[PDB]
Design a protein around this ligand. Structure first.
Ligand code: HEM
Length: 153
């Protein structure tokens, strides 16, 4: 389920803009995730104390984790169609340690798309949106395959 060269270029072109403020994007993504799907917040022992959007926005640890998430995703995206090594430890920890259903990965994928549109209305047009959908679909597909191996799928 392979992206074209042009599709990868669109993905990484918008991603280079994310990289001007990775932590801010990452915090926005986690806030969108937690507000839209509160069950996801409950998987984070270290964030479940946050009861309001303002509290989420004020948390420096949440911002840091947002940076961690998007920096790791950036690493995956820059490997384009060959991200096996980067994806492996992530699937492993999310399956066995953090116990994160694939469905929650769908939720965060949608949150990323939402945030990219919110912050970049002009640059993140339909072509880039579609290419980013495909890149995040491939991410989910490959994680789900590792989950299946490990009996978490
Ligand atoms: C784009 C998708 C995601 C990426 C790239 C990502 C990345 C990471 C990374 C790099 C870490 C630290 C290293 C590790 O433990 O593997 C981490 C930790 C963690 N992730 Fe994710 N993650 C993603 C999605 C999610 C989702 C959707 C959830 C929950 C709904 C989640 C829950 C957790 C938890 C609970 C930890 C440990 C947090 C702590 O330090 O207390 N992850 N994630």
């Amino acid at each position: 389920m392979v992206l074209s060269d042009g599709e990868w270029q669109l993905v990484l072109n918008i991603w280079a803009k994310v990289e001007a403020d990775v932590a801010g994007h990452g915090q926005d993504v986690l806030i969108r995730l937690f507000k839209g799907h509160p069950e996801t917040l409950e998987k984070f022992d270290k964030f479940k104390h946050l009861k309001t959007e303002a509290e989420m926005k004020a948390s420096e640890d949440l911002k840091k984790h947002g940076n961690t998430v998007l920096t790791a995703l950036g690493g995956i995206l820059k490997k384009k169609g060959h991200h096996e090594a980067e994806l492996k430890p992530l699937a492993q920890s999310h399956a066995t340690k953090h116990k994160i259903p694939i469905k929650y990965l769908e939720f965060i994928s949608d949150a990323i798309i939402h945030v990219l549109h919110s912050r970049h209305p002009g640059d993140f047009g339909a072509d880039a949106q579609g290419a980013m959908n495909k890149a995040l679909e491939l991410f989910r597909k490959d994680i789900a395959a590792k989950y299946k191996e490990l009996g978490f799928q």
